[PDB]
Amino acid sequence: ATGGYVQQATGQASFTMYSGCGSPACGKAASGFTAAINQLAFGSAPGLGAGDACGRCFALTGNHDPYSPNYTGPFGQTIVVKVTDLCPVQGNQEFCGQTTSNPTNQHGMPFHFDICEDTGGSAKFFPSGHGALTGTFTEVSCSQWSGSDGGQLWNGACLSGETAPNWPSTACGNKGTAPS
């Protein structure tokens, strides 16, 4: 996509959970299930504001725990998240370090979703005792997502991806250039 970001409507991903998603990089939180996506897919860099992932909805499915290779299941439910946040390259190399020159993370995955614990999404997705998974994602209509958006935390905040057609398309737009 513009800026060299890698923004695809379906693919393979890793998954983790995080806490504290009330002041996220898109500039608006949301009451439903939300996630951060790795920088290369988010479409912005820390401090540059919203990227084109902002507001888009994705169905996530886990099917392997790389830290427990003998575990065969069960896994969690498929959940639909709205992307509100950025998982940056710098802060999280193992999972979100994909760049244009090395577009997979340490688990071989080209995308990563960090699911916010606060609003309940991680409790539906991760079976107890398994905090990192790999699997798949697919972009869906936000008709499949439940919740409401919060108010803008700053000028330029954007969740307009929530009404956009699936990638390829443009809603909030990408900022800057993807990490090399």
TrEMBL record:
Keywords: Signal. SUPFAM superfamilies: Barwin-like endoglucanases (SSF50685). Coiled coil: none annotated. Residues 23-147 form the Expansin-like EG45 domain. Disulfide bonds join 21-116, 26-54, 57-142, 87-96, 158-172. It holds the Pfam family EXPB1_D1. This is Endoglucanase V-like protein. The gene is egv.
